[PDB]
């Protein structure tokens, strides 16, 4: 009776933070973060890792529309903790504002605002689609604009109290260029928070950099400013700036695009095995599988002194594309899925090798 | 339409098992198992995490039933490789069988049968209210046996096809002991086995050890037999039996009940940090704050030479109950609740550091 319960979706998501967002409490870990001042650093950081999910589901999100629509150009990450608001723009292809079908409603509703909703049920990010509503679920407001010129129309709704309340959809003809743009109050109260501090907004502020650093072809502005990367090679510079070698000469960087999925710099590490890394624009900063299929090579070819022993001077960083991506944890820091099964091959010619034996 | 939709929760678990149970292919690493003809030991295994995580649940929650009540006394696992089948039997204090006045129908049923379903939502390791239903929904077949004295009645249902297909319930009156019966046929082509092989026989056999081992004042049994486990120490005796320290000489092992949510042995390792422990009867394989808090204290005293250098001479093993625990993972190996969250303390006496001083 009062013992023996059901709950809804909705109650049990609130009632199980942990199982759906990750941890709702402070973690304290070394971690990379831009800092406004230093730019690009890895420091003692303390945050809620379910905090950093809501966002990092948003922001993957645009980076998932890129692969939808090719034609997309530019995001928009503005994040502003004084009114404690984040907004993400992205242009090409809006979302369809029309209503659907089956279920009765204009898809951007359905699909922001009711649970296990996803256009990739049947190579993004996006899969299970949570996402969206949990992001909308642990914010006190939470808006939805979007624009299809295809479909003739623009839509804009707003969710508030955990995706308990919602004005009606504001419906308007449209013929202009696409945008999604979603603008979101976290709800401090469930990690515990006054405000967003320097410490989430500097781990915020490295995932735009991370976007600018993963996903080709897209412009990212952080608060209204382009930020400098154009490939993979100048993100990575972003690391390695000013880093020292035995000899007390920078670091030389190795890169190789083997295709339009691996993408891939090299270099020394003289405190042991690390490791950058992304698949389909998330950061798995604990690894995974596709770190392990790479390293393989790399420590294989090398040799020609136990592999164990090459991984600890070597420093990864890979940008790479999977089907249907798996992972440990809520907060994907680690990808589970088999190389059989990643759909794509990475094939890393001689000269890269070559090039790799000459640094330390 | 068919791009943008909607699932069903079902439909979604099957859709993405992975999000669940966990990882649905195989995973190799060294692990503790009993191999019948050896016993317990640390070996290279190869098995399914969502196959281990389906039988985890259901035996964890005879384990729970033991807090839930106490004159539970008995156990009884039984796994049938051939058959493709496996039987979970516990006594005390059966699921009343009664109509559920809100949901309209009989408990077992509702708890067995129907998703975000526990007793557990307003110290047992259940928590989430999925964990039968998903065993139930990777099983071909999956029965419910339970009778509850207090409630005059007996109850008896089967679901086939993942939870798609369903006997009515048999009820009978009833005025015999309690028991609570689970049996169920995983299915394996979800995790494309042939048969239950060594390598899962001697994980789930070693969870039936681990129980013995975890739980307090319950008798366990294994394919109709008894385990010669009572005790903490007994059970970690399985782990030191014929280890040698540096000088050949077996390993001294010291114990501490510090209070009934905290039960303690301590060894040296000389294969570095090392840990065996339990949450709620849960095996936390990769460890947890619980096993950092405890740890901490001895590493604390001893010195009175970094922390980090002792760390690699312990052989901690915990046996702990913790209020309402959380996890990075679905296969729950490593435990994430903040001490200042787990609702008890550690405190150890002298006499445990003084013995403890006085092996390696
Ligand atoms: N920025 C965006 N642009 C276009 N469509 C989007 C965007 N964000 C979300 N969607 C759509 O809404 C769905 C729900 O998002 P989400 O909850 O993350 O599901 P998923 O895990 O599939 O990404 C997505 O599958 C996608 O189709
Ligand atoms: N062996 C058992 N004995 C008694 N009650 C049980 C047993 N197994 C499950 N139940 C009941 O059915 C509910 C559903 O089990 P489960 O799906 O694991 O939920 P939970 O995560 O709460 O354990 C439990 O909360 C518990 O109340
Ligand atoms: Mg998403
Ligand atoms: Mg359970």
């Given at each position: 009776?009062?013992?023996?319960?059901?709950?809804?979706?909705?109650?049990?998501?609130?009632?199980?933070?942990?199982?759906?967002?990750?941890?709702?409490?402070?973690?304290?870990?070394?971690?990379?973060?831009?800092?406004?001042?230093?730019?690009?650093?890895?420091?003692?950081?303390?945050?809620?890792?379910?905090?950093?999910?809501?966002?990092?589901?948003?922001?993957?999100?645009?980076?998932?529309?890129?692969?939808?629509?090719?034609?997309?150009?530019?995001?928009?990450?503005?994040?502003?903790?004084?009114?404690?608001?984040?907004?993400?723009?992205?242009?090409?292809?809006?979302?369809?504002?029309?209503?659907?079908?089956?279920?009765?409603?204009?898809?951007?509703?359905?699909?922001?605002?009711?649970?296990?909703?996803?256009?990739?049920?049947?190579?993004?990010?996006?899969?299970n689609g949570y996402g969206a509503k949990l992001c909308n679920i642990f914010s006190t407001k939470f808006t939805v604009e979007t624009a299809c010129?295809?479909?003739?129309?623009?839509?804009?709704?707003?969710?508030?109290?955990?995706?308990?309340?919602?004005?009606?959809?504001?419906?308007?003809?449209?013929?202009?260029?696409?945008?999604?743009?979603?603008?979101?109050?976290?709800?401090?109260?469930?990690?515990?928070?006054?405000?967003?501090?320097?410490?989430?907004?500097?781990?915020?502020?490295?995932?735009?950099?991370?976007?600018?650093?993963?996903?080709?072809?897209?412009?990212?502005?952080?608060?209204?400013?382009?930020?400098?990367?154009?490939?993979?090679?100048?993100?990575?510079?972003?690391?390695?700036?000013?880093?020292?070698?035995?000899?007390?000469?920078?670091?030389?960087?190795?890169?190789?695009?083997?295709?339009?999925?691996?993408?891939?710099?090299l270099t020394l590490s003289e405190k042991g095995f690390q490791q950058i890394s992304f698949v389909n624009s998330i950061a798995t900063t604990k690894?995974?599988?596709?770190?392990?299929?790479?390293?393989?090579?790399?420590?294989?070819?090398?040799?020609?002194?136990?592999?164990?022993?090459?991984?600890?001077?070597?420093?990864?960083?890979?940008?790479?594309?999977?089907?249907?991506?798996?992972?440990?944890?809520?907060?994907?820091?680690?990808?589970?899925?088999?190389?059989?099964?990643?759909?794509?091959?990475?094939?890393?010619?001689?000269?890269?090798?070559?090039?790799?034996?000459?640094?330390?």
């Amino acid at each position: 009776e009062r013992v023996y319960q059901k709950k809804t979706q909705l109650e049990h998501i609130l009632l199980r933070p942990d199982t759906y967002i990750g941890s709702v409490e402070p973690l304290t870990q070394f971690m990379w973060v831009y800092d406004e001042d230093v730019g690009m650093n890895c420091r003692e950081v303390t945050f809620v890792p379910g905090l950093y999910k809501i966002f990092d589901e948003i922001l993957v999100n645009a980076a998932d529309n890129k692969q939808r629509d090719k034609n997309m150009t530019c995001i928009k990450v503005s994040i502003d903790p004084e009114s404690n608001i984040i907004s993400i723009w992205n242009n090409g292809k809006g979302i369809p504002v029309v209503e659907h079908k089956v279920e009765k409603v204009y898809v951007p509703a359905l699909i922001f605002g009711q649970l296990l909703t996803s256009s990739n049920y049947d190579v993004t990010g996006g899969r299970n689609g949570y996402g969206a509503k949990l992001c909308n679920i642990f914010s006190t407001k939470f808006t939805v604009e979007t624009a299809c010129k295809e479909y003739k129309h623009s839509f804009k709704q707003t969710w508030m109290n955990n995706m308990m309340k919602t004005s009606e959809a504001k419906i308007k003809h449209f013929d202009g260029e696409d945008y999604t743009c979603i603008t979101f109050q976290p709800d401090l109260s469930k990690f515990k928070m006054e405000k967003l501090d320097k410490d989430i907004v500097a781990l915020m502020t490295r995932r735009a950099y991370d976007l600018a650093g993963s996903c080709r072809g897209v412009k990212v502005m952080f608060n209204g400013k382009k930020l400098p990367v154009n490939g993979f090679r100048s993100y990575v510079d972003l690391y390695v700036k000013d880093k020292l070698d035995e000899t007390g000469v920078a670091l030389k960087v190795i890169h190789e695009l083997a295709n339009e999925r691996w993408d891939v710099c090299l270099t020394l590490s003289e405190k042991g095995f690390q490791q950058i890394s992304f698949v389909n624009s998330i950061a798995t900063t604990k690894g995974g599988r596709h770190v392990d299929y790479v390293v393989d090579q790399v420590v294989g070819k090398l040799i020609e002194v136990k592999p164990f022993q090459v991984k600890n001077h070597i420093w990864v960083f890979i940008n790479c594309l999977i089907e249907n991506p798996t992972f440990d944890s809520q907060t994907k820091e680690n990808m589970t899925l088999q190389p059989k099964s990643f759909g794509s091959k990475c094939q890393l010619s001689e000269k890269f090798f070559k090039a790799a034996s000459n640094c330390g």
